[PDB]
Design a protein around this ligand. Structure first.
Ligand SMILES: [Mn+2]
Ligand SMILES: [Mn+2]
Ligand SMILES: [Mn+2]
Ligand SMILES: [Mn+2]
Ligand SMILES: [Mn+2]
Ligand SMILES: [Mn+2]
Ligand code: NA
Length: 326
DNA sequence: CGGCCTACG
DNA sequence: CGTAG
DNA sequence: GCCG
């Protein structure tokens, strides 16, 4: 079992859901306590289990696996022997975990903001609404649309959104293209949001494109919330039969020279991409982001035509999007 | 010991 | 700080 | 929490 998540296929459907979900509760809780390091280990351990070919049924089957030490192994052992891990159950039933989960699920609220509100005694979404001067415009919008934003986005919704985004993009710039990214490109059937990557085959034509797209969507009444720029984190008013629902949509523009890097980054998964960037720097001495792959000694950028080109330059076997579900 | 992804809004 | 994957 |  390779140690980096970008070195192994991780399918959407796997065989150790109960174990991985327990480890991911401890990872989320570690984040709520401000330990990115513990979060990362528990996330990595959970991800190792997603890549295994069969169910883990005995603790023996963990020996030698990367990112399993004393703590993650004891969690699995308790689950195998008893069906529950006391530590996991204490976290999941705790007021702190439940409230931090509630608050950080709001668009515009992260751990540091949620932790301050917790320390101030706040506990419910109505507590926040009762104190609106304490909110940014982004948080106001997240709270206003929280019910809709908690409803899974379905493929039906994606296809409708892709059509209205394609229409606005075509109106703003002939020849520009729209590519579905994020979890739906990895094969997920549901999501929290929809992610789109926009480019144009002639380098430089996409300059100024995203404000033009946003103006065109807003004039069609499709935008509930937004705000030169190249990433827009929007809330769309998606028509439904007789009505509408709020949906989170991310729109990203990249020049075509950067498109393989942006496609790779925005397709995820989040852990897959952090692991790939770590691998690139720590194992290959190259710096990776959604704009390019930089050799800091030659001070040159790798010219990629495809995602496959990037994997090859990093010495990695290519994984299609549906195997990046780390 | 000390790192843990690397950007944009 | 928030957002993204 | 795990590991280079
Ligand atoms: Mn026991
Ligand atoms: Mn997404
Ligand atoms: Mn840029
Ligand atoms: Mn230390
Ligand atoms: Mn994400
Ligand atoms: Mn520690
Ligand atoms: Na949030």
């Amino acid at each position: 079992m390779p140690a980096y998540a970008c070195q192994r296929p991780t399918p959407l459907t796997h065989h150790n859901t109960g174990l991985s979900e327990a480890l991911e509760i401890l990872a989320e809780a570690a984040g709520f306590e401000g330990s990115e390091g513990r979060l990362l280990t528990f996330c990595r351990a959970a991800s190792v289990l997603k890549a295994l070919p069969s169910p883990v049924t005995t603790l023996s089957q963990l020996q030698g696996l990367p990112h399993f030490g004393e703590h993650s192994s004891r969690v699995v052992q308790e689950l195998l022997e008893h069906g529950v891990c006391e530590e996991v159950e204490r976290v999941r039933r705790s007021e702190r975990y439940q409230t931090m989960k509630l608050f950080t699920q709001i668009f515009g609220v992260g751990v540091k903001t949620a932790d301050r509100w917790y320390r101030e005694g706040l506990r419910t979404l109505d507590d926040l609404r009762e104190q609106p001067q304490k909110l940014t415009q982004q948080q106001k919008a997240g709270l206003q649309h929280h019910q809709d934003l908690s409803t899974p986005v379905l493929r039906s919704d994606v296809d409708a959104l892709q059509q209205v985004v394609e229409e606005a993009v075509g109106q703003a710039l002939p020849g520009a293209t729209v590519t579905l990214t994020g979890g739906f490109r990895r094969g997920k059937l549901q999501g929290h949001d929809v992610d789109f990557l926009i480019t144009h085959p002639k380098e430089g034509q996409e300059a100024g494109l995203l404000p033009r797209v946003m103006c065109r969507l807003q004039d069609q009444g499709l935008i509930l919330y937004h705000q030169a720029f190249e990433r827009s984190f929007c809330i769309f008013r998606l028509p439904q039969p007789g009505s509408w629902k709020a949906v989170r949509v991310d729109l990203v523009v990249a020049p075509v020279s950067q498109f393989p890097f942006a496609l790779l980054g925005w397709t995820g998964s989040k852990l897959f991409q952090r692991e790939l960037r770590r691998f690139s720097r720590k194992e290959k001495g190259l710096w990776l982001n959604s704009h390019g792959l930089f050799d800091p000694e030659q001070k040159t950028f790798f010219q990629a035509a495809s995602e496959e080109d990037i994997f090859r330059h990093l010495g990695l076997e290519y994984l299609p999007p549906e195997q990046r579900n780390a």
